[PDB]
Design a protein around this ligand. Sequence first.
Ligand code: FAD
Lengths: 133, 8, 665
Amino acid sequence: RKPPKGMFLSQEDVEAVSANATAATTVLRQLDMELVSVKRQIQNIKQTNSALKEKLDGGIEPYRLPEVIQKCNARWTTEEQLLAVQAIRKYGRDFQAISDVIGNKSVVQVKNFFVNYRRRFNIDEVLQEWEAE
Amino acid sequence: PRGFLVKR
Amino acid sequence: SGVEGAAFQSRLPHDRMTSQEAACFPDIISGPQQTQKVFLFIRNRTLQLWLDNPKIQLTFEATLQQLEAPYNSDTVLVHRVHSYLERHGLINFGIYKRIKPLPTKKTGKVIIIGSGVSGLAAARQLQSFGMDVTLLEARDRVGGRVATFRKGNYVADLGAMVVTGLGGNPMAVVSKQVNMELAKIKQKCPLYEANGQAVPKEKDEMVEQEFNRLLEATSYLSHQLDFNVLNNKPVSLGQALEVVIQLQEKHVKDEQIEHWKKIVKTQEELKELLNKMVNLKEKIKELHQQYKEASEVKPPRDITAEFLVKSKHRDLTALCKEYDELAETQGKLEEKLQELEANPPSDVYLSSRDRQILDWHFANLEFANATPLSTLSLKHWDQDDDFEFTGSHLTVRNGYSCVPVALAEGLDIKLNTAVRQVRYTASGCEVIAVNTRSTSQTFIYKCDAVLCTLPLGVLKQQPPAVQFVPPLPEWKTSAVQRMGFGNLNKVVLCFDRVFWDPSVNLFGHVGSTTASRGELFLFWNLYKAPILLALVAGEAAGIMENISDDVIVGRCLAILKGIFGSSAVPQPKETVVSRWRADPWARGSYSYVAAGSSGNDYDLMAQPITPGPSIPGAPQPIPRLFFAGEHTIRNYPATVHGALLSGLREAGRIADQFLGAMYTL
Ligand SMILES: Cc1cc2nc3c(=O)[nH]c(=O)nc-3n(C[C@H](O)[C@H](O)[C@H](O)COP(=O)(O)OP(=O)(O)OC[C@H]3O[C@@H](n4cnc5c(N)ncnc54)[C@H](O)[C@@H]3O)c2cc1C
């Protein structure tokens, strides 16, 4: 029914090695050269990845901005309103980005702002100006 | 034949 | 044990009628199941009786005496059974005390060529049936391929040596009849490489296991995959093993390839992640500078200038978020590569050291079949497996020849008589022989029938050593050519002292190359005296015959020195070297199933020859030329017991032919 354990013999493999006189060593050569090919291909990409790792050395430590934990506020200062309109011009509908720029407004408050000031800040125009880019 | 094999 | 145990010990199913029984008792087997069971019991019980005491003749009277009801009620059936068993040598075979001294006058005349075991077996039987029997032997001794060297206290068999188990072995009966000192063989066989260093139990076990597994694989190739024809030529076992080994090497390389192929797929996935990470660190370095410059603009500042600072702050932490998630992925892949590289698949399938130890195992197989594996039939080399005996193998400690010699007692044996021509016709046979000493001194033997027990190597000779008149029919000679006749030699080393492990029966030696794997690869310690026995098998067997004894014994000592110590191995007092292929009365050792042959050829060999009629238009003649011998018994070839059984077989057939079968009514 099936070969013994640790023994691999498919009908296909038999016909391939018994095809002719030295079809045995021919197949064993292809795989011997395939092994060399893939082995030096490893060292090649291992060399490339080693050089790319030295450029990433140090990480992004000199470029990290300290933790600015600030309490959320309900009131919209004139300042905050102006930041918002500019944030809409730059970020469109990304309510998360806008929220982070202003700093003290939650993602829902940003969505509220869109509805509340829609007329007074021509937010339609500001959004279509962002779309043109 | 087989029967003569050592180390069975 | 019981009646069923006797059927087993006689190689018969206890609960079923055989083909040979169906022929002699067609009334019973075609009849009701009730009768068959009575027959089977009668048969079995009679066998039991004979087996329980094989040193005395079992008569019909003694048999009926010890039967119960309703078995002893039908005395003709009991007689038919006893006679059948007696005729075919299942009871009253070998050397036993005869109750009724032999019949006054003989009937029919049979010439038996060869006094090997097969010949001797038949001879006794035919004489027991009251026929005139004469054996013609070319040698100056009986036994033929059962050769036993004797000198002083040294006793070593140059031919047959091992009894392959007693469970069903007719030699078990023989051993009870003859003073045979049967010692068991301990299965442990330590190997020793070319240098003399023992093979570590780690290697030993893995190679042996690999050997057995490679064998099973060839068996799988043959029966399941049907790999039996290659370029119109029949596939040998040697071919098949190579093919299997190559596929095991191919797989090893296949495994390595897809393992490294796994590494490059991950290494190249990492390469793309590093490019993304480098391009992001570049944009972070730039964006930080931008935010820096936005903060340098000291307050107070308008809202656009304030927004810029805030904007670049968000943009920078967003890109700092991504790089942190990508350093996470880098950590995952970086260890996943250390995972796959930590556990590599097999470096090689087998090393040069391995392949050498595997070659010893092939030598074992080449010894067992007495031939290069390139000659054996893949499909059939092991066709007699089903009929192996049960129990541990034994050796004859007092020498095997004791058996032929004991069988030869009370028999007309003409030694030094070399048969040259066999002539057989409708009216009878004449055998022309000569004296081996003065080869011009000619003899003529007239007989009703000839039993030929010539070795297959002899029958094979070209040009013929024995001429058949008329020539043997095409079907017979084709069988002779097709069949394989192997070669296996022994070197007997006799010392003054035991320098080996006295509790070890046999130890191997690993040769340097594949070419020399058979050469002195095995050593036997079996006998009372300090005797070591070295095998020469495989391709090496044939080539070592063209080499002098001194050189052979030289290489023997060389090896033993390497294993036991240069000063632990003394000079041998007596040495013998067999040359079975060169021996004109053997022309080889024993038969094997050659590639292109099958088990059916063995049957063809046992088939008797019936001559043509003298006068044209005369009735179909009696069969005149009969064949026994090791090469004629499909289920037990290449053995003593096989030859023995074939002898019994033919005696039965001859007696049936010339004395008539009274038991078939
Ligand atoms: C090295 C070796 C080891 C063996 N070990 C074992 C073993 O361990 N166990 C086992 O069961 N079997 C073993 N055998 C096999 C066994 O020995 C034989 O199968 C058996 O002895 C054959 O008996 P035979 O009567 O068929 O042939 P033989 O015993 O050869 O009888 C044939 C006879 O014919 C004679 N003869 C030949 N030509 C002529 C002629 N022209 N005129 C007259 N006579 C002639 C021969 O001299 C010989 O006596 C071994 C064989 C060998 C070679």
